[PDB]
Amino acid sequence: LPVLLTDLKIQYTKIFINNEWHDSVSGKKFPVFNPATEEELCQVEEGDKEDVDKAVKAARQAFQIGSPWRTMDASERGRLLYKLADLIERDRLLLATMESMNGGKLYSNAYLSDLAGCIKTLRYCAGWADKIQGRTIPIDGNFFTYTRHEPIGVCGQIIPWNFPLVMLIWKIGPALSCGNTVVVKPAEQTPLTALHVASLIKEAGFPPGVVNIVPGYGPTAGAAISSHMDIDKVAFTGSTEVGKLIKEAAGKSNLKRVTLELGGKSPCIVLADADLDNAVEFAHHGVFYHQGQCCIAASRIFVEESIYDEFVRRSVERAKKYILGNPLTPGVTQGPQIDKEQYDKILDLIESGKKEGAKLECGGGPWGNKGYFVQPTVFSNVTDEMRIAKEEIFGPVQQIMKFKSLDDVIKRANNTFYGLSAGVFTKDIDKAITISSALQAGTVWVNCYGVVSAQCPFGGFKMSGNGRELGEYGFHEYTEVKTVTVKISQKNS
Amino acid sequence: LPVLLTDLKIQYTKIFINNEWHDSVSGKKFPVFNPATEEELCQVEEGDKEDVDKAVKAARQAFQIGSPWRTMDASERGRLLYKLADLIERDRLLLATMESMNGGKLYSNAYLSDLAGCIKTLRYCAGWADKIQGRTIPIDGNFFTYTRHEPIGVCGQIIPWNFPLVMLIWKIGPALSCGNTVVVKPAEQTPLTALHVASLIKEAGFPPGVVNIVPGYGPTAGAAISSHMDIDKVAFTGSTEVGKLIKEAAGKSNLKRVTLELGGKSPCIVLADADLDNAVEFAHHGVFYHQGQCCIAASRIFVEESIYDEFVRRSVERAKKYILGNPLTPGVTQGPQIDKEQYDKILDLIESGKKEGAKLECGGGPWGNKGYFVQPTVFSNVTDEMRIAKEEIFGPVQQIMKFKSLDDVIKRANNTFYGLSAGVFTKDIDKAITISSALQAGTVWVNCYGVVSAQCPFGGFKMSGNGRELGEYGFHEYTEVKTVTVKISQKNS
Amino acid sequence: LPVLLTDLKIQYTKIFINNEWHDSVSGKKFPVFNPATEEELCQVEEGDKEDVDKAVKAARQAFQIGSPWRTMDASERGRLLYKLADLIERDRLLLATMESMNGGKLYSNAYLSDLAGCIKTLRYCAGWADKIQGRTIPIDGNFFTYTRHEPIGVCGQIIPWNFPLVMLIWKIGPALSCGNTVVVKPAEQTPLTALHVASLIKEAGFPPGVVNIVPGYGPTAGAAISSHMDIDKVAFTGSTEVGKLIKEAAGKSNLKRVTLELGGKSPCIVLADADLDNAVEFAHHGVFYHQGQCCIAASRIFVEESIYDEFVRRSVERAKKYILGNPLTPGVTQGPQIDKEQYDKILDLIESGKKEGAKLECGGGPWGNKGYFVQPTVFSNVTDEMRIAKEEIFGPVQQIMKFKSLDDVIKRANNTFYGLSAGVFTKDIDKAITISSALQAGTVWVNCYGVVSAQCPFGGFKMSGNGRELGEYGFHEYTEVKTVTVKISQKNS
Amino acid sequence: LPVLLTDLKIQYTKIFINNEWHDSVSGKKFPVFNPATEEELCQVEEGDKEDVDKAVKAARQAFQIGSPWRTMDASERGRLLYKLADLIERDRLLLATMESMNGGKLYSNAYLSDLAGCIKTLRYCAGWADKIQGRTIPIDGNFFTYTRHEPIGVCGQIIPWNFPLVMLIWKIGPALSCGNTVVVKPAEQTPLTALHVASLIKEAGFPPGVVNIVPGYGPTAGAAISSHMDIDKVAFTGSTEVGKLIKEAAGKSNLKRVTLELGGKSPCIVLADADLDNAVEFAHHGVFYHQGQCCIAASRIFVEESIYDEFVRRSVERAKKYILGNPLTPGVTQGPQIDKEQYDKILDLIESGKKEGAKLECGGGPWGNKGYFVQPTVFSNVTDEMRIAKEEIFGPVQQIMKFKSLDDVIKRANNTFYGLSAGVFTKDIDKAITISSALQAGTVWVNCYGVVSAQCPFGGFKMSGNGRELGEYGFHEYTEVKTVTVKISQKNS
Ligand SMILES: NC(=O)C1=CN([C@@H]2O[C@H](COP(=O)(O)OP(=O)(O)OC[C@H]3O[C@@H](n4cnc5c(N)ncnc54)[C@H](O)[C@@H]3O)[C@@H](O)[C@H]2O)C=CC1
Ligand SMILES: Cc1ccccc1-n1c(SCc2cccc(F)c2)nc2n[nH]cc2c1=O
Ligand SMILES: [Cl-]
Ligand SMILES: [Cl-]
Ligand SMILES: [Cl-]
Ligand SMILES: [Cl-]
Ligand SMILES: [Yb+3]
Ligand SMILES: [Yb+3]
């Protein structure tokens, strides 16, 4: 695990449009902070409506018929993506450090996992570029019919603060491989890595206007994207609240295509026959990963009565090993929460668990003199109407619950408007297959948790989102199908 | 072209839920009229919120894990669809007559085309049932990963009055083949054929609650579907206005998946080298078909100057041959418009064409003492800011316009928030391919128009809709993908 | 289980070419016998070279560009297949009776399973007809590129005597759905059902020459197909010996495409943790089905030492319940072998098991005064170099063997030039996945055996064959891909 | 067009097995010559049976379950292929020079086209590695069924001398992306570039035994591959003669999968309405490219009478511009033929054209004092029974013929046992589509010729080969499908 052997100097702090750096139209700038110390890192140009309009004009223009981005070989789109990946690999130390410092993200994860995932996902998406194919179709009558799987056009992409880089690449990888142009709104908390990557998009040689990045706020820059009359599609990861707002803004404006990923309250079902240690470990990592700030956090763990006490005891043991501190310092195993709002939300919900009569096993309060740190907390005997069983906490707060009836627990597991993911732990083949089939969730893990890869489509059932990202299937959501039907004298099979 | 040799007796006039006929909860009924005579045909139970709630409970229950519809072979879903098609083929005379009488639809088309399309589309969709497949995926790490392409769940389906039967089958065919359950809201103008088909769904042996049909009004029964918290997906064909309302209702309620088809202002581009007669004929049929009441109506026809006068003259000649009258009487070649609202809208827009200084070639007013008949009308010298060039008329009103610059006409053709379809007429290969690629439209026809088949996906660019119906691609919009990832000791390729 | 309530009258005994019945060119006829009584059933026209030449001319002519079979809608090919299926369903009693009487096949299976499989497979294949699609491809440079998945052309299809009808439909279903024409050579033992089906192909309305059926002998009619210079492809199921001859004949003549299915020596691996009764039952059915005359017969069963004695004891118990007799008489549970050659081969191999020092648990000799009956026989303590462990017996002869080392048994299971299928019986997920991945076999069943369906591709590893039949994947082997690449002024994505 | 600024030193001259250099078992070596000067370049270890056996043992061992090549991520296979491509890009000057010197291949083409194609094809194939997916299948009954698209195993790959490097990459790219191991037999004329690439496979880090390269002769090393009992599949490009031998050897030995590409006698059809200059240019390049030594050479050009004389005159003009000489010297536009045998074959066929009464327009004899040079030669008034109209010449010998009947010329174009490719030149859409549909050829170009790319599948109809290379479709021929069917308590859709 190597490190930057030189202090991080922040350089890229402007709005990126047509491969150049722009001040905000208003002249305004906003602060960006380090969540571990609560100190300002730098000022960044604040994008708003007017800036979004500039980015959209640039992206429209880059999408025009006859432009370099439309006429270049598909394989050359792929080539540019593979080059960007190599650039990101080149600046990996730097990027991982920036991610950690701005994101409150453990550096060893930032380096070994976030940066790796970026690189690998870009490479994956690069490979798809010239393998996006339409069809020839044996339509009734004397016609030749084919389809083109075209890019959609200008895609507005709104990204959260929990995985700034991964989410950037998850959005732009697919969009660009299929031949779209994009207007990206990073989280106001975490603009910095996206702008470094913007420099690399320029260095890689993407045509100007193919990628535009407008840092700024949600009700300002975000609302302007969702309501924009010349944006063909918006993709979003974040809160359910905002998801509703994007969808409605889109309905009122130009009926743009919308896709959403909106977090979860994901359940694990642990059967008596499960490898217990394996189940405890994955379930534990599944809820605590990145300070609980994962859409897929395993925030309800149902364990069969006969092993419930053991499961609880081992889980507490495991949660009691963390060292809180600066995400940059080696051996530190838990960073802060992203900001005040998330922090207050977590403490408030922890308070509800106590009041509602859940059993506190460890943690339960804040930590330190600065940083938005929260002690890793475990509740046992949680019941299904408690706030902590129902609401996404997005903090290091694990819920453990008992079942003895299998039909009953599947129904409890499904009894949520969420449905991002789930976990099933058992050694029995039939139960692995039938439970996973019956769970209403977009990804179901068996005897593992949190395994996510570029090859697999990813997204929600129900109010956890719509559409899929990544995998072959995800690519469909960045194409628009056109059917072309030509009259002919006579067809032959 | 055979006919019913017995007067049509209307029989099915109730709400269809769990394979039984129900009165409205309120006890209310509404009238259904014949558009050709303006006389009431019968009374039909008026579904509203409460009735939609009953249908949704039935459809949820039929979708439950372990139910007959979830556990039966995929091939048996297909078998039921092929059986329904045979039933519809059995009652073809009757259905075509009901469609014509209630829909104001020419009987020869109703029989030879609408009924045929229903039958053929059901058969197409039946064949897909056991060929809906997921994937096995060579994910990073030691895991086995597969996807299931599951049904979504309860699908609310809102249908217009222009093609009552075709639209019913376009909705239920795909939905059912993939294994969904459905709640169908037919157009208040045209409930009758859908309820006959409901009797046939029962006779075919679909499990109760797989198909439910709730006749009723849009702001009542329709709004209840769009806003319903236990409906997983709504599909809609109709007005842009309502499309916006569905999308926003869905955003506010449970973020249900939405797909929309919303009409158009579809352009044809006719080049000097075109087969002129062929172009005039298809363009003519492309705008006049079913009294102009087609989403794909070719409502802007751009013709190269050097053949523009000829194109106009032949088009007028062609439009002057129609015989208006009862859609049931043989030799009648133009029925009425569906109702008062559409009628007033058409006359109003015709009036705007006159006032705005378009050239009237023929028609321009109403016809007859009853029925909502409108004379087939042609405007030449139409310009791009005239209301008749911009707004979907949905009446027998053809617009013809001149161009001489090809780059310019592609831009005029694309300069619309619509994008359902287009037509290109030329003998030059390069122009056929490059123009069709550059047109922003979901289907582009070359040297033909209005060719639509079960094998081809169908839908809009831009504000003409989202998602695709039919073809392989359409089937994707009725599945929800679940990724299942199993930990294994060691994988091998 | 209903029966024909009328004696079977044989009617169709001629060569079928261009939808008409032809005498053999030579005037010769050959006998067809009932394997249960050894009595001649009828005489059938003997096809030879000259007759095959007539069928190939007919099939070539039906495949010509512009013919009805090439120009008809794909959906109409499908329609004809679905109609044939309905006809076969209509004559199911008759066909099942003919199959049983000529094939020595238990009537209850003939009716409930062979006839059902025919019908269901035809329906499956009918659904694919208009869903065979090519691609549009984003090739480098300014070109439009698409592929057509055309039919290959004239396909020669050589069928065995064990599943005459199923194999006929497995060959013609796919071939016809994709739009090929065919020349079918049924087994000399079992021409009769194929010719009844030929009458039904005519009644369904297939264009003449689309299906031609030439009954006759292998070195005569078969060799003429394999060596024919105007046959584009030969498909074959049967012996390894003949498979080699087909492939070499094809190499010397016109390099026609070849696909082969050639039987097996398929292994089951039964782990200590297996549901024992379930494993014994499926393994038992897996070897005894149709008098052992299945390509997939589970002819080596490796059982973990600790349950080996139990497994053996229960298996013997099960094998001792059969009633031998006329396949037509209800309650009869084992018919005769097809003929003298197979009979002698089975007895000879049984003799080798005794001599080589395998343990005889039951059976071991012939039965009855007529018919080619063989007692159901079980060997335990079989070892890997015994003839009965190595050679396909194709008789009711079950081999049971012991293992204790799992790595070792996978290697023993794979140590064969065959590889059609295998079975794994365990309750452990990891073992189910890793064993099945490691077995070199085309289909691997887990906790079952002999489950074969139209939706699944089917074929061999190694010397058990090449290519796949059925499923989506099988359809590929009946298409020829043509790439069409058009120069264009400028492409756009 | 840069050059090596340093004389080419030959270094790699051994047999490559398990990532190490081996002498021939026999100790024998054979000469390798430069076709332009007829001088020996070096000696190379002569592989034979015994050496092929060593390579096959290495490749089997590398394919074993649990080996690094089987267990590594698919994405990592892809990573290794992309790395090899970068290495080849690194040594591009060197490789292009080696190709030109050993292959008699124009250096500017070697560099700008062969080397480019290698690089681009490797990159294409790298992208497929982790996108090779199987299916989950909704089989009848209570089962879970999936397919794995596994690698086949050990693939023997026999390569010709016309495109040594391109053919190497066309074989290994796909094979390796899918996860096979390979035993490559380069052409005895042209081993040298393949062994340089072998050094790069080692430097890239492929596991030992994944790629093995055995230089040597056809009846020795080649026959040993085709007849080898532990080689799962052989792929071959070359003569029809040898193709027959491979197929038959495979039939007799272990029934290994075979695919073949075997050259052609590819026709162009030029209609009166064609862009004449464009047609003359592409047709000209289509026959003369690389001294006529292309499988796809446009060796029969049918031109409509009314433009035939013009077409001929312009074609002669074009053929008369070549400068023959050392393929390394800039401005040289035609190299020698590969060797004596090809040279004699070309002269002999030229002699037949004269004798049979074809009209000689230019060329007709050899050139120079050394090298196997042949003057670029054009025949007009060629007729369909002349040897030069029927036999693949594989020399710079163009045939031009007249037609006036379109139905007739399609039949003449198809009247050949070949079918690799064809060209159609016209401005009419209908004719482009209907002619290309009617031509019996694997690739059909419209208004171009010789456009071949990694994205498009490539191969023959009829005796021009079987199976396809490259594109999505080509990848199928390097997988073996296994169906896995698991018994379950109850399935749900
Ligand atoms: N894969 C399977 O399901 C089958 C496997 N077999 C195996 O083959 C063994 C021998 O049985 P046979 O009946 O002799 O099978 P076989 O392979 O000779 O007969 C099957 C078909 O091939 C034809 N045939 C025979 N000689 C031919 C030739 N020279 N050219 C072209 N076609 C020819 C036959 O006329 C028949 O239509 C069996 O004991 C069994 O192990 C036999 C039948 C089916
Ligand atoms: C597949 C099936 C459907 C319906 C009823 C029974 C079966 N079936 C069979 S069928 C054997 C067969 C028939 C044709 C081709 C083949 F490759 C194999 N073979 C079997 N062997 N052992 C159990 C079997 C079975 O259940
Ligand atoms: Cl998928
Ligand atoms: Cl498509
Ligand atoms: Cl498959
Ligand atoms: Cl393809
Ligand atoms: Yb006897
Ligand atoms: Yb010489």
CB A143 within 8 Å of CB B451: yes
Surface-to-core class of residue C33, CB atoms within 10 Å of its CB (0-12 exposed, 13-18 middle, 19+ buried): middle
Tokens representing residue A191 in the block? 């603009």
Tokens representing residue C326 in the block? 């006329």
Which subunits have 3 or more CB–CB pairs within 8 Å of chain B? A, C, D
Nearest to D74 among B132, B151, B493 (CB): B493
**Catalytic status, residue B295:** yes
Does C244 contact D at CB distance below 8 Å? yes
Q: Which residues pair with B151 in a beta bridge?
A: B479
Within a 13 Å sphere around the CA of B361, how many CA atoms are in the beta-carbon half?
23
- How many residues does this entry show for chain B? 493
For helices B92-103 and B192-204, what crossing angle results, to 10°? Answer: 160
Best residue for ligand 1 mutational test, from C220, C239, C416 (most atoms within 8 Å of Cβ): C239
Q: B447 vs A244: CB contact, 8 Å cut-off?
A: no
Question: How far, in Å, CA of C214 to CA of C30, rounded?
Answer: 13
Give the N- to C-terminal CA distance of chain A in Å, as an integer: 60
Q: D428 vs B427: CB contact, 8 Å cut-off?
A: yes
Is B263 annotated in some ligand binding site?
yes
CB D177 within 8 Å of CB D211: no
Question: How far, in Å, CA of B325 to CA of B346, rounded?
Answer: 18
Question: How far, in Å, CA of C177 to CA of C61, rounded?
Answer: 18
- How many residues does this entry show for chain C? 493
Question: How far, in Å, CA of A373 to CA of A334, rounded?
Answer: 9
Closest-CA distance of chain B to residue C99, Å: 25
CB C270 within 8 Å of CB C283: yes
Concatenating the DSSP letter of every residue in D424-462 gives EE-SBHHHHHHHHHHS--SEEEES------TTS-B--SG
Concatenating the DSSP letter of every residue in C326-390 gives -TTSTT--B---S-HHHHHHHHHHHHHHHHTTPEEEE--SEESSSS-EE--EEEES--TTSHHHH
CB D174 within 8 Å of CB D149: no
User: From the CB of residue A463, how many other CB atoms can be counted at a distance below 10 Å?
Assistant: 23
Name residues whose C-beta falls within 8 Å of residue C142's C-beta, 6 or more positions apart in sequence: C487, C488, C489, C490, C491
Name residues whose C-beta falls within 8 Å of residue B42's C-beta, 6 or more positions apart in sequence: B10, B13, B31, B32, B192
Question: How far, in Å, CA of A204 to CA of A192, rounded?
Answer: 19
A260: chain B residues, CB-CB within 8 Å: 255
Tokens representing residue D127 in the block? 């992208």
How do beta strands B136-137 and B143-151 pair? antiparallel
Does A207 contact C at CB distance below 8 Å? no
Phi-psi domain of B132 (left: phi exceeds 0; alpha: psi -120 through 50; beta: other): beta
Tokens representing residue B367 in the block? 């016809």
Q: What is the DSSP letter of C411?
A: H
Does C489 contact A at CB distance below 8 Å? no
Residue ranges of A 284-313 with Cβ closer than 8 A to chain B? none
B69: chain D residues, CB-CB within 8 Å: 493
Q: Is C296 in the pocket of ligand 2 (CB under 6 A)?
A: yes
The candidate with the shortest Cα–Cα distance to A443, out of B474, C250, D260, B480, is B480
Does A489 contact C at CB distance below 8 Å? no
The candidate with the shortest Cα–Cα distance to C99, out of C52, C36, C184, is C36
Which subunits have 3 or more CB–CB pairs within 8 Å of chain C? A, B, D
Q: Ligand 3 (ion): which residues have CB within 5 A?
A: A 473; B 135, 147
Tokens representing residue A198 in the block? 């913007």
Concatenating the DSSP letter of every residue in A60-105 gives HHHTSTTSHHHHS-HHHHHHHHHHHHHHHHHTHHHHHHHHHHHHT-
Convert A369-381 to b/e letters by CB count within 10 Å (16 or more is b): eebbbbbbbbbbb
CB B129 within 8 Å of CB B470: no
Does D434 contact B at CB distance below 8 Å? no
Q: Which residues contact ligand 1 via a Cβ below 6 A?
A: C 158-160, 162, 185, 187-188, 217-219, 222-223, 226, 237-239, 242, 245-246, 261-263, 295, 342, 345, 392, 394
Residue ranges of A 318-357 with Cβ closer than 8 A to chain B? none
CB C280 within 8 Å of CB C316: no
User: From the CB of residue A129, how many other CB atoms can be counted at a distance below 10 Å?
Assistant: 25
Q: D468 vs C481: CB contact, 8 Å cut-off?
A: yes
Q: Which domains, from first to last, does chain B contain?
A: 1-263+454-493 (3.40.605.10), 264-453 (3.40.309.10)
User: From the CB of residue D23, how many other CB atoms can be counted at a distance below 10 Å?
Assistant: 13
Concatenating the DSSP letter of every residue in C414-462 gives H-SS--SEEEEE-SBHHHHHHHHHHS--SEEEES------TTS-B--SG
Question: How far, in Å, CA of B218 to CA of B225, rounded?
Answer: 10
Residue B48, amino acid: D
Task: Give the ligand at the shortest distance from the Cα of B147.
Answer: 3
DSSP element (H, E) containing C94: helix C92-103
The candidate with the shortest Cα–Cα distance to A183, out of A219, A216, A149, is A216
For helices A276-292 and A305-319, what crossing angle results, to 10°? Answer: 50
Closest-CA distance of chain B to residue C352, Å: 39
Concatenating the DSSP letter of every residue in B175-241 gives HHHHT-EEEEE--TT--HHHHHHHHHHHHHTPPTTSEEE--B-IIIIIHHHHT-TT--EEEEES-HH
At A147 the three-state DSSP class reads: strand
At D122 the three-state DSSP class reads: helix
At D324 the three-state DSSP class reads: strand
**Catalytic status, residue C261:** yes
Question: How far, in Å, CA of B84 to CA of B79, rounded?
Answer: 9
Quote the ligand 6 centre to C421 CA distance (angstroms): 29
Q: Which atom of ligand 1 is nearest to the CA of C261?
A: 1
Does B147 contact D at CB distance below 8 Å? yes
